Sequence to fold (323 residues):
Amino acid sequence: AVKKFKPYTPSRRFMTVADFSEITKTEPEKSLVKPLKKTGGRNNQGRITVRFRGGGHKRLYRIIDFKRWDKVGIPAKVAAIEYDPNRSARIALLHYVDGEKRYIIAPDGLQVGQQVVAGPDAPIQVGNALPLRFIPVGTVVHAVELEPKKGAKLARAAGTSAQIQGREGDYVILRLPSGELRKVHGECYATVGAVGNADHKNIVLGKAGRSRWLGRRPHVRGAAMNPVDHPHGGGEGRAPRGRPPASPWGWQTKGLKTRKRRKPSSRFIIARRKK
Amino acid sequence: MKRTWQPNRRKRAKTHGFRARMRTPGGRKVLKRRRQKGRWRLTPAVRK
RNA sequence: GAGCUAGCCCUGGCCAGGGUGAAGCUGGGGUGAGACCCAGUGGAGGCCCGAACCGGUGGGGGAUGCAAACCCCUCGGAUGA
RNA sequence: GAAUGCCGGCAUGAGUAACGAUAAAGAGGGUGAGAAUCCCUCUCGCCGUAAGCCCAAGGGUUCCUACGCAAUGGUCGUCAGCGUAGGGUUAGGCGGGACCUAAGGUGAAGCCGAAAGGCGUAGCCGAAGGGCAGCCGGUUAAUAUUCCGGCCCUUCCCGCAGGUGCGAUGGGGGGACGCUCUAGGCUAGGGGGACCGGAGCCAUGGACGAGCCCGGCCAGAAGCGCAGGGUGGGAGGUAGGCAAAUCCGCCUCCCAACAAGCUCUGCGUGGUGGGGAAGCCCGGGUGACAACCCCCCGAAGCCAGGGAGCCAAGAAAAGCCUCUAAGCACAACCUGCGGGAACCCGUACCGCAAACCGACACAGGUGGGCGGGUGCAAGAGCACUCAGGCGCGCGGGAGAACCCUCGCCAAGGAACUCUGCAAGUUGGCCCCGUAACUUCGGGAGAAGGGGUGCUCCCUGGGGUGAUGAGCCCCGGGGAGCCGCAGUGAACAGGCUCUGGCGACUGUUUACCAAAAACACAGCUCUCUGCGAACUCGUAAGAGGAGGUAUAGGGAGCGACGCUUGCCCGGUGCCGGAAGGUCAAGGGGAGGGGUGCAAGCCCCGAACCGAAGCCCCGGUGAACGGCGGCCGUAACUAUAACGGUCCUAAGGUAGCGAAAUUCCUUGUCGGGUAAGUUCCGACCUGCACGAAAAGCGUAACGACCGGAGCGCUGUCUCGGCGAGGGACCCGGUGAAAUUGAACUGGCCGUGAAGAUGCGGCCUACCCGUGGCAGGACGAAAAGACCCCGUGGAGCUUUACUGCAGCC
RNA sequence: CGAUGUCGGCUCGUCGCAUCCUGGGGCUGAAGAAGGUCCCAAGGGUUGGGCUGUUCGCCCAUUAAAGCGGCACGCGAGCUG
RNA sequence: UGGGAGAGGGUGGUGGAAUUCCCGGAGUAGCGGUGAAAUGCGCAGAUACCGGGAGGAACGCCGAUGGCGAAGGCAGCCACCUGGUCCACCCGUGACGCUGAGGCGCGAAAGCGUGGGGAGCAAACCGGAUUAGAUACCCGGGUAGUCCACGCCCUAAACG
RNA sequence: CCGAGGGUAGGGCCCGUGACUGGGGCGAAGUCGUAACAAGGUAGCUGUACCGGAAGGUGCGGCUGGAU
Ligand SMILES: [Mg+2]
Ligand SMILES: [Mg+2]
Ligand SMILES: [Mg+2]
Ligand SMILES: [Mg+2]
Ligand SMILES: [Mg+2]
Ligand SMILES: [Mg+2]
Ligand SMILES: [Mg+2]
Ligand SMILES: [Mg+2]
Ligand SMILES: [Mg+2]
Ligand SMILES: [Mg+2]
Ligand SMILES: [Mg+2]
Ligand SMILES: [Mg+2]
Ligand SMILES: [Mg+2]
Ligand SMILES: [Mg+2]
Ligand SMILES: [Mg+2]
Ligand SMILES: [Mg+2]
Ligand SMILES: [Mg+2]
Ligand SMILES: [Mg+2]
Ligand SMILES: [Mg+2]
Ligand SMILES: [Mg+2]
Ligand SMILES: [Mg+2]
Ligand SMILES: [Mg+2]
Ligand SMILES: [Mg+2]
Ligand SMILES: [Mg+2]
Ligand SMILES: [Mg+2]
Ligand SMILES: [Mg+2]
Ligand SMILES: [Mg+2]
Ligand SMILES: [Mg+2]
Ligand SMILES: [Mg+2]
Ligand SMILES: [Mg+2]
Ligand SMILES: [Mg+2]
Ligand SMILES: [Mg+2]
Ligand SMILES: [Mg+2]
Ligand SMILES: [Mg+2]
Ligand SMILES: [Mg+2]
Ligand SMILES: [Mg+2]
Ligand SMILES: [Mg+2]
Ligand SMILES: [Mg+2]
Ligand SMILES: [Mg+2]
Ligand SMILES: [Mg+2]
Ligand SMILES: [Mg+2]
Ligand SMILES: [Mg+2]
Ligand SMILES: [Mg+2]
Ligand SMILES: [Mg+2]
Ligand SMILES: [Mg+2]
Ligand SMILES: [Mg+2]
Ligand SMILES: [Mg+2]
Ligand SMILES: [Mg+2]
Ligand SMILES: [Mg+2]
Ligand SMILES: [Mg+2]
Ligand SMILES: [Mg+2]
Ligand SMILES: [Mg+2]
Ligand SMILES: [Mg+2]
Ligand SMILES: [Mg+2]
Ligand SMILES: [Mg+2]
Ligand SMILES: [Mg+2]
Ligand SMILES: [Mg+2]
Ligand SMILES: [Mg+2]
Ligand SMILES: [Mg+2]
Ligand SMILES: [Mg+2]
Ligand SMILES: [Mg+2]
Ligand SMILES: [Mg+2]
Ligand SMILES: [Mg+2]
Ligand SMILES: [Mg+2]
Ligand SMILES: [Mg+2]
Ligand SMILES: [Mg+2]
Ligand SMILES: [Mg+2]
Ligand SMILES: [Mg+2]
Ligand SMILES: [Mg+2]
Ligand SMILES: [Mg+2]
Ligand SMILES: [Mg+2]
Ligand SMILES: [Mg+2]
Ligand SMILES: [Mg+2]
Ligand SMILES: [Mg+2]
Ligand SMILES: [Mg+2]
Ligand SMILES: [Mg+2]
Ligand SMILES: [Mg+2]
Ligand SMILES: [Mg+2]
Ligand SMILES: [Mg+2]
Ligand SMILES: [Mg+2]
Ligand SMILES: [Mg+2]
Ligand SMILES: [Mg+2]
Ligand SMILES: [Mg+2]
Ligand SMILES: [Mg+2]
Ligand SMILES: [Mg+2]
Ligand SMILES: [Mg+2]
Ligand SMILES: [Mg+2]
Ligand SMILES: [Mg+2]
Ligand SMILES: [Mg+2]
Ligand SMILES: [Mg+2]
Ligand SMILES: [Mg+2]
Ligand SMILES: [Mg+2]
Ligand SMILES: [Mg+2]
Ligand SMILES: [Mg+2]
Ligand SMILES: [Mg+2]
Ligand SMILES: [Mg+2]
Ligand SMILES: [Mg+2]
Ligand SMILES: [Mg+2]
Ligand SMILES: [Mg+2]
Ligand SMILES: [Mg+2]
Ligand SMILES: [Mg+2]
Ligand SMILES: [Mg+2]
Ligand SMILES: [Mg+2]
Ligand SMILES: [Mg+2]
Ligand SMILES: [Mg+2]
Ligand SMILES: [Mg+2]
Ligand SMILES: [Mg+2]
Ligand SMILES: [Mg+2]
Ligand SMILES: [Mg+2]
Ligand SMILES: [Mg+2]
Ligand SMILES: [Mg+2]
Ligand SMILES: [Mg+2]
Ligand SMILES: [Mg+2]
Ligand SMILES: [Mg+2]
Ligand SMILES: [Mg+2]
Ligand SMILES: [Mg+2]
Ligand SMILES: [Mg+2]
Ligand SMILES: [Mg+2]
Ligand SMILES: [Mg+2]
Ligand SMILES: [Mg+2]
Ligand SMILES: [Mg+2]
Ligand SMILES: [Mg+2]
Ligand SMILES: [Mg+2]
Ligand SMILES: [Mg+2]
Ligand SMILES: [Mg+2]
Ligand SMILES: [Mg+2]
Ligand SMILES: [Mg+2]
Ligand SMILES: [Mg+2]
Ligand SMILES: [Mg+2]
Ligand SMILES: [Mg+2]
Ligand SMILES: [Mg+2]
Ligand SMILES: [Mg+2]
Ligand SMILES: [Mg+2]
Ligand SMILES: [Mg+2]
Ligand SMILES: [Mg+2]
Ligand SMILES: [Mg+2]
Ligand SMILES: [Mg+2]
Ligand SMILES: [Mg+2]
Ligand SMILES: [Mg+2]
Ligand SMILES: [Mg+2]
Ligand SMILES: [Mg+2]
Ligand SMILES: [Mg+2]
Ligand SMILES: [Mg+2]
Ligand SMILES: [Mg+2]
Ligand SMILES: [Mg+2]
Ligand SMILES: [Mg+2]
Ligand SMILES: [Mg+2]
Ligand SMILES: [Mg+2]
Ligand SMILES: [Mg+2]
Ligand SMILES: [Mg+2]
Ligand SMILES: [Mg+2]
Ligand SMILES: [Mg+2]
Ligand SMILES: [Mg+2]
Ligand SMILES: [Mg+2]
Ligand SMILES: [Mg+2]
Ligand SMILES: [Mg+2]
Ligand SMILES: [Mg+2]
Ligand SMILES: [Mg+2]
Ligand SMILES: [Mg+2]
Ligand SMILES: [Mg+2]
Ligand SMILES: [Mg+2]
Ligand SMILES: [Mg+2]
Ligand SMILES: [Mg+2]
Ligand SMILES: [Mg+2]
Ligand SMILES: [Mg+2]
Ligand SMILES: [Mg+2]
Ligand SMILES: [Mg+2]
Ligand SMILES: [Mg+2]
Ligand SMILES: [Mg+2]
Ligand SMILES: [Mg+2]
Ligand SMILES: [Mg+2]
Ligand SMILES: [Mg+2]
Ligand SMILES: [Mg+2]
Ligand SMILES: [Mg+2]
Ligand SMILES: [Mg+2]
Ligand SMILES: [Mg+2]
Ligand SMILES: [Mg+2]
Ligand SMILES: [Mg+2]
Ligand SMILES: [Mg+2]
Ligand SMILES: [Mg+2]
Ligand SMILES: [Mg+2]
Ligand SMILES: [Mg+2]
Ligand SMILES: [Mg+2]
Ligand SMILES: [Mg+2]
Ligand SMILES: [Mg+2]
Ligand SMILES: [Mg+2]
Ligand SMILES: [Mg+2]
Ligand SMILES: [Mg+2]
Ligand SMILES: [Mg+2]
Ligand SMILES: [Mg+2]
Ligand SMILES: [Mg+2]
Ligand SMILES: [Mg+2]
Ligand SMILES: [Mg+2]
Ligand SMILES: [Mg+2]
Ligand SMILES: [Mg+2]
Ligand SMILES: [Mg+2]
Ligand SMILES: [Mg+2]
Ligand SMILES: [Mg+2]
Ligand SMILES: [Mg+2]
Ligand SMILES: [Mg+2]
Ligand SMILES: [Mg+2]
Ligand SMILES: [Mg+2]
Ligand SMILES: [Mg+2]
Ligand SMILES: [Mg+2]
Ligand SMILES: [Mg+2]
Ligand SMILES: [Mg+2]
Ligand SMILES: [Mg+2]
Ligand SMILES: [Mg+2]
Ligand SMILES: [Mg+2]
Ligand SMILES: [Mg+2]
Ligand SMILES: [Mg+2]
Ligand SMILES: [Mg+2]
Ligand SMILES: [Mg+2]
Ligand SMILES: [Mg+2]
Ligand SMILES: [Mg+2]
Ligand SMILES: [Mg+2]
Ligand SMILES: [Mg+2]
Ligand SMILES: [Mg+2]
Ligand SMILES: [Mg+2]
Ligand SMILES: [Mg+2]
Ligand SMILES: [Mg+2]
Ligand SMILES: [Mg+2]
Ligand SMILES: [Mg+2]
Ligand SMILES: [Mg+2]
Ligand SMILES: [Mg+2]
Ligand SMILES: [Mg+2]
Ligand SMILES: [Mg+2]
Ligand SMILES: [Mg+2]
Ligand SMILES: [Mg+2]
Ligand SMILES: [Mg+2]
Ligand SMILES: [Mg+2]
Ligand SMILES: [Mg+2]
Ligand SMILES: [Mg+2]
Ligand SMILES: [Mg+2]
Ligand SMILES: [Mg+2]
Ligand SMILES: [Mg+2]
Ligand SMILES: [Mg+2]
Ligand SMILES: [Mg+2]
Ligand SMILES: [Mg+2]
Ligand SMILES: [Mg+2]
Ligand SMILES: [Mg+2]
Ligand SMILES: [Mg+2]
Ligand SMILES: [Mg+2]
Ligand SMILES: [Mg+2]
Ligand SMILES: [Mg+2]
Ligand SMILES: [Mg+2]
Ligand SMILES: [Mg+2]
Ligand SMILES: [Mg+2]
Ligand SMILES: [Mg+2]
Ligand SMILES: [Mg+2]
Ligand SMILES: [Mg+2]
Ligand SMILES: [Mg+2]
Ligand SMILES: [Mg+2]
Ligand SMILES: [Mg+2]
Ligand SMILES: [Mg+2]
Ligand SMILES: [Mg+2]
Ligand SMILES: [Mg+2]
Ligand SMILES: [Mg+2]
Ligand SMILES: [Mg+2]
Ligand SMILES: [Mg+2]
Ligand SMILES: [Mg+2]
Ligand SMILES: [Mg+2]
Ligand SMILES: [Mg+2]
Ligand SMILES: [Mg+2]
Ligand SMILES: [Mg+2]
Fold:
C-alpha cells in the first residue's frame, strides 16, 4: 500500500509515501556502506553534462552483490530487509553460513529468515540465483546478467522482471521489462522472482520540495528561453514550436530513433520494445 | 553594500602567487614579462 | 579573472516567542467481525502570527547624494525549494 | 586661435552650496602665545540583543610613553588612529605545524594528445571536520590560559619493579554521524531574604526602622556522593573477513540479562589558593579578621555516543582496542614508579568599525559567542534602566517666504485623483460569537461584540519543600474605589461584496518591470537493452550511474474536476529486402598519341556498384489546418430542409464585445442623482476553441479591475504649531557652466521665435532675500527618423562552408 | 537632429472678440410675458458632480450664464506622469 | 446421527480446439466480401497448405423443457476453503415462532478512478455501398470498452 | 435590577419581481423526413453509453409484451 495524508497543507493533499512495511532494519551494515561521491551532474572537467542535478539528501552507497556466482553452493539466511536510498528497489541483508555478509536487492515475497542459495543446483525458489540455462522456461526472473560473469544488469528497479521464453542453443530468449525480446547467454546468472516494492510507481511526490530532496533541480522549458539558448527560444508572447520539436542541441525529439544501426548487439535483439 | 574586493590571504597566494604562475605556460610568461619590464614585485605580496 | 555574481561539490553554523492540532497510540461506543464515531494522548506541516536573519511591496526623501542604488515609513518570507 | 584637441597654469560661478544623521547641551576649574573644540569636577542628554564585552577574517605598529602642531582632521586644536624618538607582543597544555583524512588538487603504475599539454586507481597535499594534555587569581605605562602564585596534566627518552607470546603500513572493532520532538538530573545565569558583613545617612512635613544604601563568592587533584553514557559472560564447531589469527563474522549449548559488575563523563564536595562592595580618603588606601549563609526561578549549555517518532535514510582517515605475519623471544610490549627531555610559527592594537570592504575619519556592507533588571500574556519584541560606552570634529544668533519630518483642526466626509496615492481607521491578550462556498483541511483573527486599572474579603488545584510554613506558577467568586480615558506610555490587522489571471509555498530583469512571467507537483508524446541514449572533450577520459525501462535523456502542457472532435494532400518523424535516380570503385566494347618494333601512355560504351532522394504506407499531447454561393416554412423575419463551387478536411464540446471586438461608449439588464470603467446577458466571434490545451474550480496573492461600510487635511479650503534647514554674524570653502559683454519693452525686420538690426517707448549707479517666463537656459557630438555598398545579436526551405551523423 | 521634452491634468494667469451672461439698441410673422434675428459693447462674470488618461463629448443637479479661440495644441530649470 | 444431488460462492493451479500476429518452408494470380457490388488486401509475393512461436479471451461434444442460487446470476478439468438444500432415524430442545417501517448487506450490463492486460469483437470515428437522400440497416477498417486486481456506481422488460 | 421598544451587526424561512434563458402545454390551416402499430419494410421494448437536423442510430447486457 501507499500512505496518503489528510489535506492539512496544500501539498499534503496529494503527497503519498511508501509504507516501508517490509523494512526490518533501519540501519545499514557498517562494513557495506561507503561514501557516495555526489557529482551535481558535472564531470571531470567540472562542466554540467547532465542538467538540473544537485542538492538532494546525503547518501551512503550500500555495496550490492550483483554477482552471486561468487559463492556457489553456500546457503545464506535472509537476516533483514533494508531501505536503500540509491535505488528504487529494497535491499536484503544476507547472512552466509560462511560468516560473510552481503546485500542483494530484495525480491517480491522474500521472507525474513528464509534461506537462499546460488548455483546450477539451486531450487527454483524466490531469491536463488542460477545460470539462465538451468532456470525453467516461463519463470519470471530478475537481476539478470547480460554477458557471463559481467554482473547483473537487467531487471533491477522496483517491480520489474524478465520472463524466460525458450532455449535457442547456447542462448536463452528473455522478455525484458520493456517488452524487448532479446537473446541472453545461458551462463548468465539471474535470480528467480520479480523485484520487490512494486508500489513504487504509485507514489505521488506532491510538491516541488520533494523533487528537490531527491537532488532534482527544476527543469526549465526551451519554450521559456531565448534563441541563444534553445531552438524553441524567443517569439513575442507565447509561441508554438514553429519547427519540428527539438532538444537544446538541435536534434528532433519526437520519434527520431537514436540507437546505432550497426551496433554489434543487433544480432542478438529479436524484437524491439512494443509499447 | 557588499563590494567587489573581499581580501583573503589564502585565496590571494593560491591564485596569483609565485607557485601558481610557475605551474602553467601562461603563468611563466607572466613572470618572464614582469622580470623583463623590471617590476619590483613579480607577484602580489601577501602576508602568509 | 568565479576574493562581485550564478550553479554545484565538501565541511561547519544559525532560525526569540506564541498559535493551529494531521497520522499514530490508549480508553469508550459499535459490529458476527468490521468500517466508523466520541473523548483523551500526541506533535505532523514547502502550516499560521512575529524578532533575529533573508528580502525589496507601495509612498516619501535624496538627486554636484551620507550613498556610482542610500535613508524613513510601510510591506514579503521566516522548519524550508 | 579654434580640432567637445593635448599638458600645465590661473580664472568665473563665490565669500555662494556645504561642513556627512535632529542622541544635546550648560557652567566651573586648569594648561597654554592662542581654548566652544585639550585635561579635570559638577549638572544635562543618548545607546544598553548595543552605540557594551569577547572571538575569527582582513589591516600591519594604528598599542604605550615623552616631546611637538607645517601638513593630515570638513572649523579650531594646547588634542589625535598625525610628526619625531624610546619602549611594548614571553606558551610542552590557547591557535597552526613536527597527526588524520573531506571536496578538490597533485600524482609512482598506466592512458591520451602536432607542440605546449590533457587525464589517471594507489600515494601525497588539502580544514573552521576528526584528534590531542590548564584552570583560577596576581602583576606592567603597555603581554599574559604565555610572566608569577596555587593546584592539576600530556608526550618522548632512559632506568627500576611487577606482568604478558612480544611484535604491523597487514585483518577486525571502534572512531561514525540525519531531521524533528523530547525525559531525568545538573550547571551557566537570574530573583528574593525578617539571615550574615559593612562606611555612613535621618534631609523638606513623617520615619531610629523586618529603615535606607551596599555586598554576601571563585578555582580546586585523589577519595566519596549524586546523576548519566558505554559494554553481556563461558565452551564447542568454523569452509568468510584476498597470508596468518586465539581477533571479528556465522551456527550450537550453558549461565547472566531493564540487575549488578567493569568502564567513561558530567555536577557536587573536597587538602589548598584566591577574591572581596558601597561610602570617603590624594588607579591607589580604608571599609574588612569583610561576611561569604537560606529560599525560589532556571537554560537553547552539560551528563551524551540519552530517548522517541519520521523519511528525504543522513563523510573519511588517524589517534585508540584487538588479532596475528614475518621476525624476535638476553629482546619486545603492558602496567606502576622515578629522573631526564619537550622544537618551529602566531600573540601588541582596531575588529558592526575613524584602524576591515566601499578613492574620504563615507548614515552603506562585514561570520561566531556573552548580551543583566523591571513592566507589557510570552520573547532576542517594546519602554526605561545596570555594567560599560557615548553626545555622532564647526559654532553663535534670528524666529520671513519656501522645503523637509512631525502635531492638531470647526462643518462636511473621497466631493480629491488616473487610483483613497498618501494619511487616518483597526490594532495585544481573555470571553462570547461568526455566512456563501468547500477539495471537508478550510474559508476564520471572517464578520460583530463584550472584558481590561486599583483596593478589600472568601476560596480552588500545581511546582519546591516534607505531607506543612516560605517561595513560586495557573486560576475562581463576591464587595468597592478613581479618572475624559485602565494592552491609561512604547511595540501590535481596517473590514466586506464581486470579477480577471496564476492552483498552491516558491523564483526573476544585482542598480527603472516581482508580474498574469519562470519554477512547481501532475499529464502526455518520444528516445534509450547498458560499453544505454544523451552531454563535455581532438583524444584518453568523465558525467549519465557505481543507476538498468516502476530507470535515464529530450519536448510540450502545468494542482484538481469535466474534457480534448474532424483533416496524413505539403513539411517532419517511423515503417517498407520491389522499382526509379544515384558517387568512388569495378568492367573494357570501341577510339586516340607515340615507336621500325615488342611496348609505353591517354580517352572510353553497355553491365555490376551505398546511403540519400524519388516512389508505397503509417503517424497530431508531430509542423500545422479546420470554406463560399443560391434557394425553401399558414404575415414579416429567419431557415430544420434542398441545391452548387471548392478543399487535405471545413471549427465538435465548451466559451464568447473577452488580458481577444475593428465598427464601439454594440444592445439589453444591474448598480449610481448621474457609470466610455464594473458585473450579468445576448451573439454578425473585424480576428475564441480544445496539452503554444478548452471550460470551471475551494484555498492561496505586497498581482490587475468594480463597489460598499468604517475613517480621515485626499478635498471643499485652508489655518496654527514643533523641530532640521533656508536668513544674520565668526571659521573653513566647492561645483557644472563660461567667445567676449557696457546683456531692457513693443512692433517690425532678419536663415522663418532678436538684449545685440530698424523705428518708437522706457530706463539714475550698485547690491540682498525671493519666483522661474526668456537667454531657442545646463547636461549627453538625438535613443526616434533617414543616410553609410558602417557594425553587431537573432532567424530561416537566402548563399557557401564546417562539426556531427549516415 | 554636438536635442527646440512630446498628450492630458494641476497651478498661475494674460489677450483677441466672430459675445455664453449682465448693460445699450433696430427689425419681428413684437398684444403681454417669453422668444427669434441682426447691431453696439471685452467691464466683470462664466458652478459642483458621474463616466473615461483623455481633449472633446454624454449624463446628473443647478445657473444670469454655464462662450469660443490665441499665447511653442500658454505654462515639466513650476508640479503631476 | 447417518447419507445425497448440484454451472451455489471464494482463491490458486491447469488442458485442448479455434481466431490474430510474428518466423521458416513450399507455392502463384488472385483473395476477400455481398442480394449484386465497391472500399479493402495482394507480383514489395497475398489467399489456400505444412513446420515453429507468442498472446488474450471464451469453454465444442456432454448440454436437456436439466441442475443450483434469495435475487442479480452461476458451465473445460483439478485441489483447497466455504454457503445453502433434500432424504432417511424419529434420538435432544420445549412455542425458542411468522412478518418486518427504519438499518445493514448483496446487487446483470453499461459507466467511473488507479494500475495492469488487449487475441477476437466493437460504441465513437473513417471509408465502400444501398438509396430520392441514408449522419443508419449491409460491407472493409477502427478507439474506448469487453478481460484481471482493488475502489466506486446501485440502475433494468432487476419479469412469473 | 428587569423591562415595551429603539439601535448596531450577522444569520434562517417565505412571497412578489428580473435582462436573458430551459423545456412544457395548447393552437393548426405550414416545412422536413417517416421512428412506432403488419416481419411497419433493420422484430420490438429496455437500463446505460457514445453519436446524429429531427424523429432516431449503434454498442453491451437484459425481456417477449416478436411475425415466419
Ligand atoms: Mg494524501
Ligand atoms: Mg495524515
Ligand atoms: Mg489518513
Ligand atoms: Mg491543495
Ligand atoms: Mg488548506
Ligand atoms: Mg509512511
Ligand atoms: Mg517497504
Ligand atoms: Mg542512521
Ligand atoms: Mg567501511
Ligand atoms: Mg561509490
Ligand atoms: Mg559518484
Ligand atoms: Mg578530480
Ligand atoms: Mg559546472
Ligand atoms: Mg543534460
Ligand atoms: Mg545538473
Ligand atoms: Mg539525493
Ligand atoms: Mg530502497
Ligand atoms: Mg557461442
Ligand atoms: Mg511492501
Ligand atoms: Mg517506494
Ligand atoms: Mg513520480
Ligand atoms: Mg521532471
Ligand atoms: Mg519546466
Ligand atoms: Mg523570454
Ligand atoms: Mg551564452
Ligand atoms: Mg545561433
Ligand atoms: Mg538557434
Ligand atoms: Mg520558436
Ligand atoms: Mg512566435
Ligand atoms: Mg516566447
Ligand atoms: Mg501571439
Ligand atoms: Mg516570451
Ligand atoms: Mg514565450
Ligand atoms: Mg507564458
Ligand atoms: Mg495563450
Ligand atoms: Mg511561432
Ligand atoms: Mg507547436
Ligand atoms: Mg510553423
Ligand atoms: Mg551485449
Ligand atoms: Mg565574504
Ligand atoms: Mg585566509
Ligand atoms: Mg583561510
Ligand atoms: Mg581561499
Ligand atoms: Mg600560488
Ligand atoms: Mg608597481
Ligand atoms: Mg628593488
Ligand atoms: Mg604575477
Ligand atoms: Mg564567490
Ligand atoms: Mg557538514
Ligand atoms: Mg526560522
Ligand atoms: Mg490538543
Ligand atoms: Mg505513535
Ligand atoms: Mg508557512
Ligand atoms: Mg511556514
Ligand atoms: Mg537588500
Ligand atoms: Mg522599498
Ligand atoms: Mg505608504
Ligand atoms: Mg511625508
Ligand atoms: Mg524624490
Ligand atoms: Mg542616481
Ligand atoms: Mg533604508
Ligand atoms: Mg527603514
Ligand atoms: Mg512589518
Ligand atoms: Mg511570518
Ligand atoms: Mg518561526
Ligand atoms: Mg514547522
Ligand atoms: Mg516555507
Ligand atoms: Mg535543508
Ligand atoms: Mg584657424
Ligand atoms: Mg571642455
Ligand atoms: Mg568647453
Ligand atoms: Mg582641451
Ligand atoms: Mg587637455
Ligand atoms: Mg547667487
Ligand atoms: Mg557634502
Ligand atoms: Mg549633508
Ligand atoms: Mg529625526
Ligand atoms: Mg580650542
Ligand atoms: Mg585654541
Ligand atoms: Mg575633558
Ligand atoms: Mg536589556
Ligand atoms: Mg590598509
Ligand atoms: Mg604609536
Ligand atoms: Mg598594548
Ligand atoms: Mg596641525
Ligand atoms: Mg593647526
Ligand atoms: Mg596652526
Ligand atoms: Mg586640515
Ligand atoms: Mg571629513
Ligand atoms: Mg604646546
Ligand atoms: Mg587622529
Ligand atoms: Mg618609554
Ligand atoms: Mg605554562
Ligand atoms: Mg620530531
Ligand atoms: Mg595525509
Ligand atoms: Mg595534512
Ligand atoms: Mg584541524
Ligand atoms: Mg592543542
Ligand atoms: Mg584545570
Ligand atoms: Mg605588557
Ligand atoms: Mg557512517
Ligand atoms: Mg560530526
Ligand atoms: Mg529539516
Ligand atoms: Mg529571575
Ligand atoms: Mg542571584
Ligand atoms: Mg521586608
Ligand atoms: Mg543531582
Ligand atoms: Mg578460520
Ligand atoms: Mg578591596
Ligand atoms: Mg586589613
Ligand atoms: Mg569582623
Ligand atoms: Mg530553542
Ligand atoms: Mg540517539
Ligand atoms: Mg523514501
Ligand atoms: Mg576516503
Ligand atoms: Mg597484557
Ligand atoms: Mg624541528
Ligand atoms: Mg617564534
Ligand atoms: Mg597577547
Ligand atoms: Mg549592521
Ligand atoms: Mg557582530
Ligand atoms: Mg576607533
Ligand atoms: Mg582609514
Ligand atoms: Mg566623523
Ligand atoms: Mg561608517
Ligand atoms: Mg551580562
Ligand atoms: Mg506589551
Ligand atoms: Mg507582550
Ligand atoms: Mg518585533
Ligand atoms: Mg535597572
Ligand atoms: Mg552633537
Ligand atoms: Mg532670521
Ligand atoms: Mg476636520
Ligand atoms: Mg464615507
Ligand atoms: Mg461618515
Ligand atoms: Mg479603484
Ligand atoms: Mg497599536
Ligand atoms: Mg455570504
Ligand atoms: Mg467545512
Ligand atoms: Mg475581532
Ligand atoms: Mg490608579
Ligand atoms: Mg527545581
Ligand atoms: Mg492615555
Ligand atoms: Mg518608541
Ligand atoms: Mg496584526
Ligand atoms: Mg485603507
Ligand atoms: Mg468577497
Ligand atoms: Mg483563470
Ligand atoms: Mg502565483
Ligand atoms: Mg505567475
Ligand atoms: Mg499549477
Ligand atoms: Mg505556485
Ligand atoms: Mg515560504
Ligand atoms: Mg530591476
Ligand atoms: Mg535592469
Ligand atoms: Mg540593470
Ligand atoms: Mg547595470
Ligand atoms: Mg524600483
Ligand atoms: Mg523587478
Ligand atoms: Mg510577490
Ligand atoms: Mg522570470
Ligand atoms: Mg509558470
Ligand atoms: Mg494535467
Ligand atoms: Mg562535443
Ligand atoms: Mg572513463
Ligand atoms: Mg560511475
Ligand atoms: Mg539510471
Ligand atoms: Mg510554467
Ligand atoms: Mg494546473
Ligand atoms: Mg467540484
Ligand atoms: Mg497532414
Ligand atoms: Mg504526412
Ligand atoms: Mg513547413
Ligand atoms: Mg580496349
Ligand atoms: Mg491524442
Ligand atoms: Mg498546412
Ligand atoms: Mg501544432
Ligand atoms: Mg472560427
Ligand atoms: Mg466534426
Ligand atoms: Mg460578443
Ligand atoms: Mg458593453
Ligand atoms: Mg471569455
Ligand atoms: Mg479576437
Ligand atoms: Mg483594427
Ligand atoms: Mg469594444
Ligand atoms: Mg475600442
Ligand atoms: Mg453607454
Ligand atoms: Mg454615447
Ligand atoms: Mg474603471
Ligand atoms: Mg482599466
Ligand atoms: Mg452582433
Ligand atoms: Mg509552446
Ligand atoms: Mg501569489
Ligand atoms: Mg503577488
Ligand atoms: Mg495640508
Ligand atoms: Mg503644535
Ligand atoms: Mg511650523
Ligand atoms: Mg525644525
Ligand atoms: Mg520651525
Ligand atoms: Mg546683520
Ligand atoms: Mg564689454
Ligand atoms: Mg522678432
Ligand atoms: Mg535692447
Ligand atoms: Mg549686434
Ligand atoms: Mg550696436
Ligand atoms: Mg544695420
Ligand atoms: Mg538696435
Ligand atoms: Mg516701452
Ligand atoms: Mg527663467
Ligand atoms: Mg528654485
Ligand atoms: Mg535673450
Ligand atoms: Mg528653454
Ligand atoms: Mg548620443
Ligand atoms: Mg563623436
Ligand atoms: Mg549626431
Ligand atoms: Mg542621431
Ligand atoms: Mg528623418
Ligand atoms: Mg549594397
Ligand atoms: Mg553607396
Ligand atoms: Mg554581421
Ligand atoms: Mg559576433
Ligand atoms: Mg545524434
Ligand atoms: Mg531635432
Ligand atoms: Mg552642446
Ligand atoms: Mg543639449
Ligand atoms: Mg452678450
Ligand atoms: Mg403673444
Ligand atoms: Mg443696427
Ligand atoms: Mg466683457
Ligand atoms: Mg480684459
Ligand atoms: Mg472627460
Ligand atoms: Mg489637445
Ligand atoms: Mg471622447
Ligand atoms: Mg433656472
Ligand atoms: Mg437670461
Ligand atoms: Mg490654445
Ligand atoms: Mg496645432
Ligand atoms: Mg498636433
Ligand atoms: Mg503645450
Ligand atoms: Mg519634469
Ligand atoms: Mg505635461
Ligand atoms: Mg506642457
Ligand atoms: Mg526647462
Ligand atoms: Mg521653467
Ligand atoms: Mg526653459
Ligand atoms: Mg506610465
Ligand atoms: Mg519479386
Ligand atoms: Mg447445445
Ligand atoms: Mg430497509
Ligand atoms: Mg452493479
Ligand atoms: Mg469503465
Ligand atoms: Mg487493441
Ligand atoms: Mg445530401
Ligand atoms: Mg472514449
Ligand atoms: Mg478511458
Ligand atoms: Mg424471463
Ligand atoms: Mg430589541
Ligand atoms: Mg424607544
Ligand atoms: Mg426501429
Ligand atoms: Mg416505420
Ligand atoms: Mg422495423
Ligand atoms: Mg448532436
Ligand atoms: Mg446538418
Ligand atoms: Mg451511428
Ligand atoms: Mg434478467
User: Anything to note?
Assistant: Residues 25-36 of chain B form the longest helix (12 residues). DSSP finds three helices and no strands in chain B. The radius of gyration of chain B is 12 Å.
